[PDB]
Amino acid sequence: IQRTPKIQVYSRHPAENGKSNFLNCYVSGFHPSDIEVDLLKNGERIEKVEHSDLSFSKDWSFYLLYYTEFTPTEKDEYACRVNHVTLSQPKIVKWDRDM
Amino acid sequence: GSHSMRYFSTSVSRPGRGEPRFIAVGYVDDTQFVRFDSDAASQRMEPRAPWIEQEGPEYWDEETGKVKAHSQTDRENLRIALRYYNQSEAGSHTLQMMFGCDVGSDGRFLRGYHQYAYDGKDYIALKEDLRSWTAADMAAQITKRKWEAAHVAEQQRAYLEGTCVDGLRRYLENGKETLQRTDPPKTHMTHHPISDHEATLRCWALGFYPAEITLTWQRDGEDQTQDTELVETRPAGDGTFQKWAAVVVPSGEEQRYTCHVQHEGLPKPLTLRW
Amino acid sequence: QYNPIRTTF
């Protein structure tokens, strides 16, 4: 079986410029478990990203949380870049502080 | 007032890149408390919640031995499954296991689980009576017949009805300041004009534990599901969870709409209006 | 508390 990842990009806490926070990319509902997830700042790969321990849901599909500390600004753009065998090319999802 | 303990393992073969990778995690309710990763330097079961750090050295030795043995067993099971399904050694495959128990408010046994999935599909599962198996395809029936013959189910019952329940009871007491408490959702509503004629109301629930929550909209006090969007519950990353529910409304009618929040940490459900 | 898993398919 193969299932494509669902992706949510969001902050740990409500964004306010100049305040430390965490940028999260939650990938879920995918199979198999091999997956590539990058966090992007202005299109560039953020170097110190951590992730949760591989786990799965009752339907056996996998989920992982990727995260990094960040201080949002008015200017800076953030995103999550996901690749998986189900995808023909990496998927980029932009961070929107209202979602 | 029920509680659960679960162990989840994933074994992935990777021909050309060494022996299969094995990762196991343990949870009480929605709280992760241990991990083991075959690829990590530690080669130990490791704590992942404060309240398990109380366990002594013997615990970490014993748990480490048990999870390592499981890793080697499911490596052999990946090899066996390849033979049962007549699959090439060139390919990568996945064997997942889940096992654990549920207890009631009184701490006594309610349900046990012991089950596997191969390449994302059910393989074999112990049935609720803890004496019979559900086998999903002709390969799993070979295993089912072997396990019936060898009384494997009976062997798991002492663990599921005994050790599992006993461990969960101890963890619930030692970790009670989180595991037997709740974080109610922090809530608020935002307003987004999206056109001259429409606006989006978004109802936020943040920092709640456990993860179970219900967010619904009403219009004039009757359920509203048209033109709504509800995101899947998602981890904040700090042990708590997030969710939101949004509705598109005609500009000027915002006051007709209410958001309703139900959560174990709320004595009374909340009603939010713009 | 883990259950030692030793049973093969």
Residue numbers in the entry:
A (entry chain B): 2 to 100
B (entry chain A): 2 to 275
C (entry chain C): 1 to 9
Publication passage describing the model:
MHC class I proteins, encoded by the highly polymorphic human leukocyte antigen (HLA)-A, -B and -C genes, present a snapshot of the intracellular proteome on the cell surface (immunopeptidome) where T cells surveil the peptide–MHC complexes (pMHC) for antigens derived from foreign pathogens. The typical 8–14mer peptide presented on MHC class I comprises only around 2–3% of the amino acids in the pMHC complex and is spatially confined within the adjacent α-helices of the MHC groove, thus posing major challenges for engineering peptide-specific single-chain antibody variable fragment (scFv) binders. One peptide each from CHRNA3, GFRA2, HMX1, IGFBPL1, PHOX2B and TH were selected for preclinical development.
Here we show that the neuroblastoma immunopeptidome is enriched with peptides derived from proteins that are essential for tumourigenesis and focus on targeting the unmutated peptide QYNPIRTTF, discovered on HLA-A*24:02, which is derived from the neuroblastoma dependency gene and master transcriptional regulator PHOX2B. PHOX2B is a key CRC protein that is among the most specifically expressed genes in neuroblastoma. To target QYNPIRTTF, we developed peptide-centric chimeric antigen receptors (CARs) using a counter-panning strategy with predicted potentially cross-reactive peptides. The lead scFv 10LH bound PHOX2B pMHC with a dissociation constant K D of 13 nM and exceptionally slow off rate (k d) of 7.6 × 10−4 s−1. We then used our pMHC structural modelling software, RosettaMHC, to model the 3D conformation and binding free energy of peptides presented by additional HLA alleles, identifying HLA-A*23:01 and HLA-B*14:02 as top-scoring candidates for recognition by PC-CARs of the PHOX2B peptide originally discovered on HLA-A*24:02. Informed by computational modelling, we showed that PHOX2B peptide-centric CARs also recognize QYNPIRTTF presented by HLA-A*23:01 and the highly divergent HLA-B*14:02. We also found that although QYNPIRTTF binds to HLA-C*07:02, 10LH exhibited 17.4-fold lower binding to HLA-C*07:02, probably owing to a distinct pMHC molecular surface in which the sidechains of the MHC α2-helix (R151 and Q155) protrude by 15Å at the position axially aligned with the key 10LH binding residues of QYNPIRTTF (I5 and R6).
